[PDB]
Amino acid sequence: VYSYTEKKRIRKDFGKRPQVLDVPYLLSIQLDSFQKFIEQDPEGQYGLEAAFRSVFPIQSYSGNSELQYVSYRLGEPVFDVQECQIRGVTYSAPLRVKLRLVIYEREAPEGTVKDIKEQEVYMGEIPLMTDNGTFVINGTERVIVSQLHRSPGVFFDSDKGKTHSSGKVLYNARIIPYRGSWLDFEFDPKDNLFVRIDRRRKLPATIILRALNYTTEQILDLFFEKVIFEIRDNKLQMELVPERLRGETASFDIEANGKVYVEKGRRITARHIRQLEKDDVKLIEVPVEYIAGKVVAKDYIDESTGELICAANMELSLDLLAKLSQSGHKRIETLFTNDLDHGPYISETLRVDPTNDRLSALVEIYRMMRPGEPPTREAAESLFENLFFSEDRYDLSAVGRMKFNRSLLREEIEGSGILSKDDIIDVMKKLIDIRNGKGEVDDIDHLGNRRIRSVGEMAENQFRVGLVRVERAVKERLSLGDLDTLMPQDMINAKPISAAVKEFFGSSQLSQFMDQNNPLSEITHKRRISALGPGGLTRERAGFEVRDVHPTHYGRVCPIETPEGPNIGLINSLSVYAQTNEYGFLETPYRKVTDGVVTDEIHYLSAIEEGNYVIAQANSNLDEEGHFVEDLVTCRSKGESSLFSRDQVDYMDVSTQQVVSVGASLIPFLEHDDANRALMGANMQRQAVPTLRADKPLVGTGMERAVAVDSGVTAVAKRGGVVQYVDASRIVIKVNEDEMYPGEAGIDIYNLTKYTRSNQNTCINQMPCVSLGEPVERGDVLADGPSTDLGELALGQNMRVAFMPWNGYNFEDSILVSERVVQEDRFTTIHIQELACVSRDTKLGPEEITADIPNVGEAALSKLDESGIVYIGAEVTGGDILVGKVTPKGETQLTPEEKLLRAIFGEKASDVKDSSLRVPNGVSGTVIDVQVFTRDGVEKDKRALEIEEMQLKQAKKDLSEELQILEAGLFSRIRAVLVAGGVEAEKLDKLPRDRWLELGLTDEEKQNQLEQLAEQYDELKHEFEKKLEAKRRKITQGDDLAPGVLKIVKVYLAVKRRIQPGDKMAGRHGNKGVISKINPIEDMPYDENGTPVDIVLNPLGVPSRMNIGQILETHLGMAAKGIGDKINAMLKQQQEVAKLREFIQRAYDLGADVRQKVDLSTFSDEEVMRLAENLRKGMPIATPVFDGAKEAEIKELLKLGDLPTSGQIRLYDGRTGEQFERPVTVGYMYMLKLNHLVDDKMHARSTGSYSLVTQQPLGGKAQFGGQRFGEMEVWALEAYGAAYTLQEMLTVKSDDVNGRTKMYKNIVDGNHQMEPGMPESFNVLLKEIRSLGINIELED
């Protein structure tokens, strides 16, 4: 069963795989994040509560005063969104905190206070988020882009055998915290362990172990295994553990229990080890030579003399063994070291390390961290203890602790955010294990090692920074001065916090203007995963390892949507179904597969857990239960594809389009395109300009309706009902009775947005798409936005294309356009500009907005009213005066000849200088709106008073109308109540409505209905009055402009650019091209019915570029328009409804085993006619991205019309009338119109304004600048013999101050000759060198 917005024009669907998970709300990222930020969180872990609990309470300098936090409350904004955009202010809400101040007493370290005081203190305004995920920061809509940064935790990277001659691999750990110093542990080519805190100078790695209060014996105990020795009256019998015997050759007669097991010279075999274990051998006898290199393990002191025989970690030799023989020691502990399994890394590091105990290690860390100042006993301890183990200056915090515990294979996933001795020891142990051979390194691009920040997290961090600066200020104020029974308002300042948060939201690498020239462009800007920004890798210092597409992007980040150019692969876009874990990592749906059945329960798997399982492919056949119809299914298990069994599978993909993003899932036949061309198409599909009459995609994907509705452009109904009055600017839905709350009398009022400008100067304007008295259900679309159509995203028009070379007018990539495309006004777009004229307060006097401008005639001033401001609706052109403004002038010291001229003609120069705002050259529009802002000390002119009166009348009429609709509904509901339980079929309509609210009722729940409705009516009655007074105050009051500006006038032109050679067009498959001609109608190729083609593309664009998508789209569009033309023919003569039913059913039953049964016998014989009317321009067709419509189905559809199966007809020539040989492809392709308009690119300059220090022209087209004759062009001119052109190109044209004017005079005298001189930039260079000590001069 279909919704009433889908029984109008229902898109034929060609997909075969039944979907099981509907597309999630596309903007969940921004909305969920900022909802987590501004939210009462009782167990404060995220939100403003986390910041307040983290930085509060603030304790004075032992002054027995603490400032402690209680709660907070977001106020409500003074201006809503529309008024914030009109007036030019941020959209924010005042944050108000309840703070409590205590003053303790004496003889009471924790004793009770002597006085408390709680006060609600205002601290800052945080900008709220609109319903669509965009902030309004200064009148404009900003979008904060998510970030993809490396997750906090421990990462055991490697070196991959570089940076050394021998090609050794140098492993190294790193401990990245969320806030605080780094801590590495790198090897060196001698296998000594080294630590470098904060990426500083290197140190031997046992320095930090000694700093953690470990002696040498404890270090050797932690990192090694003791090999005991014994002295059994001779022969040095040694305790044995059988496993350790591997990897060595027997250097002596290995015997025990009176039996020789392995002899000298023979290596130890694994079976020999098994024999030793089986024989149960504990103690053997080894020669004294075996201790020639065995490192001792603990200190030994001769008990006779009390002297240190041998310090720990010192190689035993024959002399030492003889010395400690008679010493009375029979136990000797050594270290078990091998060359492949237990290396002696820590022992060698101890030998290199020049420290001896805790104090010297702390001094060594101090000299490394803070060189120059002399270390002290307490300063070194405080530095080391505040480095890592202090909560004020080190946090991991929670994702960091989870990654840390999991990477060392620990049971728990939550702990202290600061380090500890065991954490550092375990990192060192794991690194040593990785060196030994067991374990693998962590690749730092695995999408399980890269988090995603969002707006909530970044705004929370910035607010925390604001809080800590206020904390320092408070703790300064709390200690000094007095006790004093002050209040916790004078102690706090609200400018630092508001400054910090506003500086984040308004100026950052991640807070950028929302490009707003589509629904698709907005909805793909809000879903961006940037890698740049604060705390992320810069563009210059990112290699090729992170620019690349990883096997973990499958279902999390799109592979074919990334901006080519300087940052390709740093600005990834989120996939369709991809979500965000609790911690921040990305995850994607999968279907749980039981024994053999593909269940339809959905599990989201992050990037790590996806590795363990085996996951089938999206397009795997299954029959009515879920059993895979094959015995082998193409799965992917360990990051690599492979063919597995039917029973080993564990999960199956949830849809065939879950890999590609939302921009690249709107391209039909993507599986036929290339990858570079698909990238270009996905990037050019979001620059399309909303045209005048947005049309439809004739070949779509089914992802259009979701993008249109989920983006905020359209006006989706909230509760179902019946349209009561639809206007060009208002829709009034009357809610169904069952969806109505007991109190209200529901009638929703939707106010449409009419002709406002977007950020890219285009126009956004909603038109209602519902008739009058037409039922609507919940979630229907009531107003097509910019570039949508009945709820389906439509970015451009579909026009009859033909693939043939046409006399060279489509040579390289150009396009030859018919003239019907400009006669029908289908690519004609509307652009809206804003021009401002500020009236400042100069030193010689204020400027004015008068209409009496000096020395200008009368035709220019004919379009200005009495107050010097242009009318509304006045068709201005380039150069006309919009706002007449004159500034005061000095004396100007006029030349003698002009003095004589004035003396002759008696004319007197005026004392004011004309500086009026005038239309920029080139544009020619209609003025649609004028806004006047006046500072609150200036007498408003007549036009500002007229605008105020219009605004006030409009507001009063609006509120009266609101109360009229609502009162009509309220009394309708009251009358409907009066029909049952107190029926008055004729006793009611006679008396006036003012007494309908005061009648009787019976003892039911219906008793408390008339009273409720009456009281709601009274509430609305007073609410109208209060809203009216509020609006009148907000209108009649003055503005608050910049300091020193009296009034601002803003004029909105509405240009309308059509089409011309130069304008860039493109399809969806990345086939761009500049329009090259506008051919007359009678010169285009025509088939045997006389219909010309509208666009003639080039064949040779297809084979070299391999975007075969466009040709299949052309064939399918031809089939769709053939169905449309057949329906139109059946509808032109009024045949019947049965014939229409039969044909449309046959058109909807193609092809081979599709979904979406569309049985038309349930349509009511009148909804068939509306459907046929909406299909008379061509039946829309849906081709899901990788599910596709096969070529055989396109042939069958072409046969269902009458078009030729081959897809190619025979076209005749326009001018000669004789047919082209070799039949050519025609069909309807869907073409966009990118906003690289020619009349924004074209520029020319003869002479304008020159720069300040180096007298050279300025930059392009906004300051009337000249083109840059750079270095490569100078080499090109030197390669010729062109020495005179070069000399004029860098002295007279550009830089030489006298040559410019002399050349201009010589040109206007008809004498082409130059007198070059010397450039001014060279004199600037001479002064800037000579201003060092370097004397440079020009000697002849």
């Binding site: 001094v363 060189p371 120059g372 100042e373 002399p374 270390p375 002290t376 006993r377």
Partner: peptide
């Protein structure tokens, strides 16, 4: 306390003044 002259291992013309 512990001292090995320290001149000069650092720039920082305020650290020199404090020393």
């Amino acid at each position: 306390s512990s001292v090995e002259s320290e001149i000069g291992r650092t720039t920082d013309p305020v650290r020199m003044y404090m020393r």
